[PDB]
Design a protein around this ligand. Structure first.
Ligand SMILES: Nc1ncnc2c1ncn2[C@@H]1O[C@H](COP(=O)(O)OP(=O)(O)O)[C@@H](O)[C@H]1O
Ligand SMILES: [Mg+2]
Lengths: 564, 90
């Protein structure tokens, strides 16, 4: 493989590549837009070191005090039925409803797993609301507390629109601490300074600044209190030790310790109260979409790289001719029960069949008889398409052509030509029809045809009857050319029986469906039965850039008409 | 930007001196709140003025050697490296 090969493969699979890449980018964009934005607030703490202070800030003693102050064990979440309802509601400009709850006591089921009891609050108006834990409906009003069914709830200042639901969870105190501790981080930012950079992340920009202020104040009170405690302990013992000159001397020490306790001042200090950065830190939309593009491309490339190395079908007539198989024509796919040579004579596929008609006039000379058998390797390779249209292009040249549908198994040529289905080839071979009663004329054609008749139970044994050679010997005197349509050779043996009485035999190879070895196996199965295959007809060729770079030619053909 | 950097320097200058006094200012703050035997009241008065002088004279740790001036040659865009990259990339 080289540059031209891979570029032709990329050009051919451009629909697959573009679709897979666009799907990946669409998923990346939908994630970047629907993912909940997570903000970050930061405070700066300056200790009068800074190692032990970090572990005390992240302790359940300091953090647990914040959970109690702000009631962080009362989890309230806007109710959205899908996993994307929250993101799209944000895109529609809907402001998220928030309700302020100051007292919440659930019945505390505390079962095997659900240690977090939950209720659902449905806003009815600005003042009153509803509650349903397990179907039990309870009506509540802002202000007046509710103590019913073992459920204590106090909702203040419902700021939402009617109909909105909210999941109200009472998670345990440790779970509230573990959630806060997971989003709360402490750093030193100088590794030597007394400066502490407290950061906190969360989906609510205002709430996380109130939490980080509560954490900081608590830590500030505790830090200073400890420094205060040493002087409060000495002043405590002084108050316990006061029993006259020494009494006045202790009185001076009395106020000197009063001043110190009053002054306080922790080594730790606050320089910046918590404010929230309005730009969310997550999701990082650019890196998500960029990864979506790049991941979509490398996936599209490996899929194309696999389909290229895995495909075995024919790509050009050159592959067949490397083995020594004469390819007499390459018929393109006709994008246009009709005969193509009759419905659209100017079709690009009919122009390729005319090139086969002239190639055969030179190849069918020096043959035993004027009988041409057309077979192939696999079914639906185009044997009936080519033979029936080849007969139509030879009929317009003024020749008497007979098309024999010797596919006694799945032949449908009678349906394609208009049929008096009675008395086909089967009825003749079984002896219940004369040769004159089976020949019929194609209406918009110009050649006679013999249909297959009724499907016999022994198609391969009927063709071995001496009547078949009698029909061909009779028809070879009343027609200039007999074209015999046959089943595929790698399916059944009918074509090897018929090919004994045909002077010329051509195989039809489907463009990408058949393999080169599949056509070589077919030609050698004929030769083993005494049938000499003159050559091959590549059918169903499509325009491909990979063929133009791998070989010099794509073998599709040019359109040549005056446009009017 | 030279007016801003001068403001940042002077604010950090005024602020820094104040910071060292803040330990003695908080002590002085509580003392004023604690000013009401009489001999101790005089001992507090000695501490009262000692906190006033300490706060006033507590200016240190920050000196501004040079005031902000703007370099008249822009630092960006670097025209030479941009045009050179334009040639090489082209
Ligand atoms: N080159 C072609 N262009 C357009 N249609 C084709 C072409 N070859 C085959 N076909 C269509 O695909 C189908 C298969 O053709 P058919 O004669 O039934 O195959 P076979 O006899 O080899 O089993 C037909 O409906 C035919 O119209
Ligand atoms: Mg057929």
């Amino acid at each position: 493989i080289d540059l031209g090969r891979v570029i032709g493969e990329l050009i051919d699979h451009r629909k697959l590549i573009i679709s897979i890449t666009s799907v990946f980018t669409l998923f990346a964009i939908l994630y970047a837009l629907l993912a909940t934005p997570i903000y970050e607030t930061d405070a700066l703490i300056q200790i009068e070191q800074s190692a032990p202070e970090t572990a005390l800030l992240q302790s359940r003693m300091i953090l647990g005090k914040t959970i109690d102050d702000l009631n962080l064990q009362i989890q309230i979440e806007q109710k959205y039925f899908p996993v994307i309802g929250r993101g799209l509601a944000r895109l529609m400009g809907e402001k998220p409803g928030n309700i302020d709850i100051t007292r919440l006591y659930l019945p505390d089921s505390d079962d095997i797993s659900n240690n977090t009891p939950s209720i659902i609050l449905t806003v009815k108006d600005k003042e009153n609301y509803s509650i349903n834990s397990d179907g039990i409906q309870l009506n509540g009003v802002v202000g007046t507390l509710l103590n019913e069914k073992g459920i204590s709830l106090l909702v203040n200042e419902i700021d939402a629109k009617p109909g909105d639901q909210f999941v109200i969870t009472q998670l345990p105190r440790l779970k509230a601490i573990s959630d806060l501790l997971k989003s709360f981080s402490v750093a030193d930012l100088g590794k030597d300074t007394g400066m502490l950079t407290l950061t906190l992340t969360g989906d609510n920009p205002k709430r996380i600044s109130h939490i980080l202020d509560s954490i900081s104040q608590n830590y500030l009170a505790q830090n200073i209190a400890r420094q205060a405690a040493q002087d409060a302990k000495s002043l405590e013992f002084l108050n316990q030790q006061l029993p006259r000159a020494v009494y006045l001397q202790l009185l001076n020490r009395q106020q000197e310790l009063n001043i110190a306790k009053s002054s306080a001042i922790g080594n730790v200090r606050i320089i910046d109260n918590a404010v929230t950065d309005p730009n969310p830190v997550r999701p990082k939309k650019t890196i998500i979409i960029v990864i979506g593009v790049v991941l979509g491309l490398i996936v599209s490339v490996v899929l194309v790289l696999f389909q290229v190395f895995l495909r075995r079908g024919i790509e050009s007539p050159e592959q067949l001719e490397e083995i020594g198989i004469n390819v007499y024509a390459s018929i393109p796919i006709s994008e246009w029960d009709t005969l193509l040579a009759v419905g659209n004579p100017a079709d690009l596929a009919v122009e390729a069949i005319r090139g086969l008609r002239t190639s055969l006039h030179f190849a069918m000379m020096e043959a035993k008889n004027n009988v041409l058998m057309i077979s192939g390797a696999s079914p639906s390779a185009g044997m009936t398409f080519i033979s029936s249209n080849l007969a139509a292009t030879i009929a317009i040249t003024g020749k008497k052509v007979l098309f024999i549908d010797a596919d006694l198994r799945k032949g449908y040529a009678h349906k394609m030509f208009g049929h008096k289905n009675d008395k086909g080839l089967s009825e003749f071979l079984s002896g219940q029809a004369a040769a004159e009663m089976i020949i019929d004329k194609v209406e918009g054609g110009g050649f006679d045809y013999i249909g297959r008749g009724q499907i016999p139970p022994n198609p391969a044994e009927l063709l071995m009857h001496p009547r078949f050679e009698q029909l061909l010997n009779w028809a070879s005197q009343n027609y200039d050319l007999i074209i015999i349509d046959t089943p595929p050779i790698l399916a059944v043996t009918d074509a090897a029986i018929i090919g004994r009485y045909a002077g010329t035999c051509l195989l039809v190879a489907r463009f990408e469906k058949n393999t080169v070895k599949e056509i070589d196996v077919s030609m050698k199965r004929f030769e083993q039965s005494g049938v000499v295959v003159k050559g091959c007809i590549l059918n169903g060729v499509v325009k491909k850039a990979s063929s133009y770079y791998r070989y010099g030619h794509n073998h599709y053909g040019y359109s040549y008409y005056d446009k009017k | 930007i030279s007016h801003i950097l001068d403001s940042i320097s002077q604010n950090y200058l005024a602020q820094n001196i104040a910071r060292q006094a803040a330990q003695d200012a908080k002590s002085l703050e509580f003392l004023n709140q604690q000013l009401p035997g009489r001999a101790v009241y005089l001992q507090l008065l000695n501490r009262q003025q000692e906190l006033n002088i300490a706060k006033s004279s507590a200016i240190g740790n920050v000196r501004i050697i040079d005031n902000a001036v703007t370099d008249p040659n822009p630092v960006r865009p670097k025209k030479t490296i941009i045009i050179v990259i334009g040639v090489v990339l082209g």
